[PDB]
Structure formats: C-alpha cells, structure tokens
Design a protein around this motif. Structure first.
Motif, PDB file in Angstrom:
ATOM      1  N   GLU A  79       0.816  -1.205   0.000  1.00 13.40           N
ATOM      2  CA  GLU A  79       0.000   0.000   0.000  1.00 13.40           C
ATOM      3  C   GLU A  79       0.855   1.263   0.000  1.00 13.40           C
ATOM      4  O   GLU A  79       0.487   2.245  -0.657  1.00 13.40           O
ATOM      5  N   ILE A  80       2.003   1.235   0.700  1.00 11.67           N
ATOM      6  CA  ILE A  80       2.949   2.344   0.779  1.00 11.67           C
ATOM      7  C   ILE A  80       4.355   1.820   0.509  1.00 11.67           C
ATOM      8  O   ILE A  80       4.670   0.658   0.773  1.00 11.67           O
ATOM      9  N   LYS A  81       5.220   2.720   0.037  1.00 14.66           N
ATOM     10  CA  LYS A  81       6.583   2.404  -0.384  1.00 14.66           C
ATOM     11  C   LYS A  81       7.561   3.324   0.334  1.00 14.66           C
ATOM     12  O   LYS A  81       7.327   4.532   0.425  1.00 14.66           O
ATOM     13  N   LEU A  82       8.661   2.765   0.840  1.00 12.12           N
ATOM     14  CA  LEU A  82       9.556   3.561   1.676  1.00 12.12           C
ATOM     15  C   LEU A  82      10.345   4.585   0.888  1.00 12.12           C
ATOM     16  O   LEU A  82      10.984   5.455   1.494  1.00 12.12           O
ATOM     17  N   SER A  83      10.274   4.520  -0.435  1.00 14.55           N
ATOM     18  CA  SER A  83      11.011   5.375  -1.348  1.00 14.55           C
ATOM     19  C   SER A  83      10.199   6.548  -1.863  1.00 14.55           C
ATOM     20  O   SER A  83      10.793   7.504  -2.360  1.00 14.55           O
ATOM     21  N   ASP A  84       8.869   6.495  -1.798  1.00 15.29           N
ATOM     22  CA  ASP A  84       8.080   7.597  -2.332  1.00 15.29           C
ATOM     23  C   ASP A  84       8.368   8.901  -1.595  1.00 15.29           C
ATOM     24  O   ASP A  84       8.866   8.897  -0.468  1.00 15.29           O
ATOM     25  N   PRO A  85       8.093  10.033  -2.231  1.00 19.44           N
ATOM     26  CA  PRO A  85       8.192  11.310  -1.523  1.00 19.44           C
ATOM     27  C   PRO A  85       6.996  11.512  -0.610  1.00 19.44           C
ATOM     28  O   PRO A  85       5.929  10.920  -0.796  1.00 19.44           O
ATOM     29  N   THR A  86       7.203  12.357   0.405  1.00 18.19           N
ATOM     30  CA  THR A  86       6.120  12.655   1.334  1.00 18.19           C
ATOM     31  C   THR A  86       4.907  13.193   0.604  1.00 18.19           C
ATOM     32  O   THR A  86       3.767  12.934   1.005  1.00 18.19           O
ATOM     33  N   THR A  94       2.419  21.849  -0.283  1.00 17.58           N
ATOM     34  CA  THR A  94       3.069  22.527  -1.437  1.00 17.58           C
ATOM     35  C   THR A  94       4.245  23.388  -0.964  1.00 17.58           C
ATOM     36  O   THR A  94       4.189  24.614  -1.160  1.00 17.58           O
ATOM     37  N   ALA A  95       5.272  22.761  -0.386  1.00 18.00           N
ATOM     38  CA  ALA A  95       6.517  23.445  -0.055  1.00 18.00           C
ATOM     39  C   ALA A  95       7.690  22.779  -0.764  1.00 18.00           C
ATOM     40  O   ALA A  95       7.802  21.547  -0.792  1.00 18.00           O
ATOM     41  N   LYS A  96       8.570  23.604  -1.331  1.00 15.14           N
ATOM     42  CA  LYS A  96       9.682  23.092  -2.121  1.00 15.14           C
ATOM     43  C   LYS A  96      10.785  22.470  -1.274  1.00 15.14           C
ATOM     44  O   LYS A  96      11.658  21.802  -1.830  1.00 15.14           O
ATOM     45  N   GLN A  97      10.766  22.642   0.048  1.00 14.30           N
ATOM     46  CA  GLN A  97      11.812  22.029   0.864  1.00 14.30           C
ATOM     47  C   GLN A  97      11.603  20.535   1.076  1.00 14.30           C
ATOM     48  O   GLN A  97      12.562  19.842   1.438  1.00 14.30           O
ATOM     49  N   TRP A  98      10.389  20.021   0.836  1.00 19.65           N
ATOM     50  CA  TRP A  98      10.094  18.611   1.064  1.00 19.65           C
ATOM     51  C   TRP A  98      10.532  17.714  -0.084  1.00 19.65           C
ATOM     52  O   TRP A  98      10.474  16.483   0.067  1.00 19.65           O
ATOM     53  N   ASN A  99      10.977  18.310  -1.200  1.00 20.68           N
ATOM     54  CA  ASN A  99      11.446  17.569  -2.364  1.00 20.68           C
ATOM     55  C   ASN A  99      12.767  16.870  -2.088  1.00 20.68           C
ATOM     56  O   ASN A  99      13.780  17.517  -1.812  1.00 20.68           O
ATOM     57  N   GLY A 100      12.765  15.547  -2.246  1.00 22.50           N
ATOM     58  CA  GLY A 100      13.880  14.707  -1.869  1.00 22.50           C
ATOM     59  C   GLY A 100      13.633  13.907  -0.613  1.00 22.50           C
ATOM     60  O   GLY A 100      14.398  12.973  -0.320  1.00 22.50           O
ATOM     61  N   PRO A 137      14.232  22.917   6.677  1.00 23.32           N
ATOM     62  CA  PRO A 137      15.260  22.011   7.210  1.00 23.32           C
ATOM     63  C   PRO A 137      16.546  22.722   7.594  1.00 23.32           C
ATOM     64  O   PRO A 137      17.023  23.618   6.895  1.00 23.32           O
ATOM     65  N   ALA A 138      17.116  22.288   8.724  1.00 24.01           N
ATOM     66  CA  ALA A 138      18.488  22.650   9.061  1.00 24.01           C
ATOM     67  C   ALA A 138      19.503  22.103   8.057  1.00 24.01           C
ATOM     68  O   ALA A 138      20.353  22.849   7.588  1.00 24.01           O
ATOM     69  N   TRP A 139      19.433  20.818   7.715  1.00 25.35           N
ATOM     70  CA  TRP A 139      20.410  20.150   6.850  1.00 25.35           C
ATOM     71  C   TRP A 139      19.738  19.471   5.671  1.00 25.35           C
ATOM     72  O   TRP A 139      18.509  19.281   5.625  1.00 25.35           O
ATOM     73  N   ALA A 140      20.577  19.052   4.729  1.00 23.58           N
ATOM     74  CA  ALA A 140      20.035  18.281   3.624  1.00 23.58           C
ATOM     75  C   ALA A 140      19.407  16.977   4.135  1.00 23.58           C
ATOM     76  O   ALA A 140      19.773  16.475   5.204  1.00 23.58           O
ATOM     77  N   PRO A 141      18.428  16.434   3.414  1.00 23.98           N
ATOM     78  CA  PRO A 141      17.904  15.113   3.784  1.00 23.98           C
ATOM     79  C   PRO A 141      18.957  14.022   3.624  1.00 23.98           C
ATOM     80  O   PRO A 141      19.867  14.122   2.794  1.00 23.98           O
TER      81      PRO A 141
END
Ligand SMILES: Cc1o[nH]c(=O)c1S(=O)(=O)Nc1cccc(-c2nnsc2Cl)c1
Length: 354
Positions: A79-86, A94-100, A137-141
C-alpha cells in the motif's frame, strides 16, 4: 522461576528502586522463550493499589517501535513504499523544501532536522499542515540524524492513509489483535481505567496529555504481559502466522543508517552483539548526529542487541533483547528515571542469564 533468574533480577532491581525512589515497577524477562514476571511497589500510592501483571503503564516512545512495525506491515501489503516522496501521500503539502524527502527520512529521523516535538499550539489538521509547510530544514535530507517525535509521528499518520482506516483502527486490526495483545490500548477505556496506573512526577500524580500526533509517537499504553508477548514476537518473527506482520517486524529490525556503533531501523535501535556496555550506556544518555548510509539496508541480524527507550512525564520504559541467545528483558515504571540506569540494569541481568 529458576533461582538464577530470580536472584539476579532481585539483586540488580531492588537497589534501583532504592536509589531512584521509583514508586512501582513491572519487570518481565524472556529466557529460552519462556517469560517471567516480577513486580514491586504501588500503582496508585493514594489508593494503595499495587502494581500487578495487569497494571498498565504508558509506554511513551516505545510506541514508536509499534508505529514502525505497523508501517513495515503496509510495506508488505504494497500500500505504501519507503522510497516515495512525502508529497505523494500528502498532495496539499506545497513546499519546495520537502522535495527529496522520502518516508525513510520521515521514519529514521533523517529528514533534515525536523523538530523533536510537535508544537502545543497545533491542534487541528490545518495547524498541522501549516506547521510542516513553514518548517525549513536545518540540513540536507539523508545526512544528519535528529531523533524527533514529529518525524516519526507523520510517518505513522501517512503510512495508513491509503488503507482508509484510522491509525488506531489499523493498529488494532493489524498488530494488536493478531498477536493477542488484548490489554494494550491507544485510548484506555473506562473498563480498564482501574488497571491504569498514575505517573508520579515531582511527587504529583500525572497522566499523558492529549496532543497532535500523540497516538503515532507516544500514545500507546500497555501491560507487562503484552510487552512480554511483544518481545517474544520480535525475538523470532517466523512464528507469526500472518505474512505481512512477520515481514513488518523483520523490516523493523533492518539497519537503514549507521552512526557511531549504533544502527537505525524502524523504531528500533540495533547494536552488533556482543557490545561494550559503557559505550551504549553513554549512548543512551540524552542531539545532532550524522549518519553513514547503508546501501542497501541490511536484513535483520540475529546476533544483535535490539533495544528502545520510552519516556513520559510520569513513566519510564526500556525494552531490550538478543535474538541469538533467545533472551530479552523489559522494564516499566511510573517514574521517569535516567535511561543509563535502565540500560546498566538490563545489561547485567542479560549478561548473567547469557
Ligand atoms: C532519549 C529518549 O528516548 N525515548 C524518549 O522518549 C527519549 S526523551 O528523553 O527525549 N523523552 C522526551 C524528551 C523531551 C520531550 C518529550 C516529549 N515531546 N512531546 S511529548 C513529550 Cl513527553 C519526550
């Protein structure tokens, strides 16, 4: 109860209460697969109600190991995949910081330093959307590990959305029931209120407070028998008849990140057994740690020390076990005392029964 287990449990445990002033403790030990129960003290010093094997304690963080397994479950079910984006499970974000930022980041506290706690002013879904929409975010993912409730709290809120059921309802129909944990609850009902022990902080009687995403990270109260059955399930996942739940456990004990001599999994922490005691004791004390990615996530290693801590305003809980020797020990108490005392105590008891 064999004399060896009984002796070492008492000679180790009784000073702990004496030194930490702990009102009531339940301690279960699993040895060669067989559980053993011990209690001390009072569950309700005001109503002179003791602590029994049916006395409920707030697990707190140890709820996160439940939230991990319930997600690994839905990984097995597809049903869910550990690789998908949030954003695939939350399009309104709709925030660009969540990409990745995948769900592994959400689960293993590598999302870029999400706050350790969800703010108390966040009560409605709209407040929760704005909170995660404005966070930066403080740091990169995937680079640094900051233990946080709000990272794992959202993982468990989003890991059940395709299935259409509330997190309580999924949890109950897919982990609690199938493993015959009938005295573990998210919301304590009036019927079990009598089994509900009051936590003591600063001498004052206190229970866990409602909060945003509180079921998903620290909302799970349980009894000493259900912790014993839960450890027994995590010792050897092959006896679970349900194939999705077995896989969900086995995934939970998989090493995704490495920092120092510890490994990050899905709510649990693993250590290559045998381990230096002092090292892990100072590792259990209460910060920003950076992680070296494990490509690919290692499968559950039997010869591991698998442990997790749980703290609440009024309760303290610790669970540890070693698959290879079929050994384990869980401690729960209605006063939040220092974690390294729990860990020292687990280590001596387990080393003696080893
Ligand atoms: C190391 C550890 O491992 N498991 C744990 O729970 C802990 S802890 O020391 O950091 N406990 C803790 C500390 C600070 C705040 C909160 C909290 N946030 N929302 S409610 C509550 Cl209470 C919980």
């Amino acid at each position: 109860a064999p004399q060896q287990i009984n002796d070492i449990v008492h000679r180790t445990i009784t000073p702990l209460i004496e030194q930490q002033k702990i009102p009531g403790m339940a301690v279960a030990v699993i040895y060669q697969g067989k559980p053993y129960y011990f209690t001390w003290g009072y569950a309700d010093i005001a109503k002179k109600q003791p602590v029994t094997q049916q006395t409920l304690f707030e697990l707190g963080s140890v709820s996160k190991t439940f939230t991990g397994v319930l997600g690994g479950d839905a990984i097995a079910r597809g049903e869910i995949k550990l690789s998908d984006p949030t954003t695939k499970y939350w399009p309104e974000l709709t925030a660009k910081q969540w990409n990745g930022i995948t769900l592994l980041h959400l689960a293993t506290y590598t999302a870029g330093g999400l706050p350790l706690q969800v703010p108390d002013e966040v009560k409605s879904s709209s407040d929760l959307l704005r909170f995660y929409q404005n966070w930066q975010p403080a740091w990169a993912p995937g680079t640094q590990r900051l233990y946080a409730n709000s990272s794992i709290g959202l993982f468990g809120a989003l890991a059940v959305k395709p299935s259409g059921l509330s997190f309580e309802q999924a949890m109950q129909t897919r982990v609690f029931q199938p493993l015959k944990l009938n005295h573990t609850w998210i919301n304590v009902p009036p019927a079990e209120e009598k089994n509900y022990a009051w936590g003591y902080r600063e001498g004052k009687a206190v229970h866990v407070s409602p909060g945003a995403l509180d079921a998903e990270a620290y909302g799970v109260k349980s009894t000493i028998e259900d912790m014993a059955r839960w450890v027994q399930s995590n010792l050897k996942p092959l006896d679970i008849n349900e194939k999705t739940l077995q896989q969900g456990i086995q995934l939970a004990q998989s090493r995704y990140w490495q920092t120092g001599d510890m490994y990050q999994g899905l709510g649990w922490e693993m250590l290559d057994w045998p381990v230096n005691p002092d090292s892990i004791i100072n590792g259990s004390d209460n910060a920003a740690r950076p992680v070296k990615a494990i490509t690919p996530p290692t499968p559950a290693v039997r010869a591991s020390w698998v442990h997790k801590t749980g703290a609440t305003g009024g309760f303290g809980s610790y669970v540890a076990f070693i698959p290879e020797k079929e050994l384990g020990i869980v401690m729960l108490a209605n006063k939040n005392y220092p974690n390294p005392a729990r860990v020292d105590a687990a280590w001596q008891i387990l080393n003696a029964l080893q």
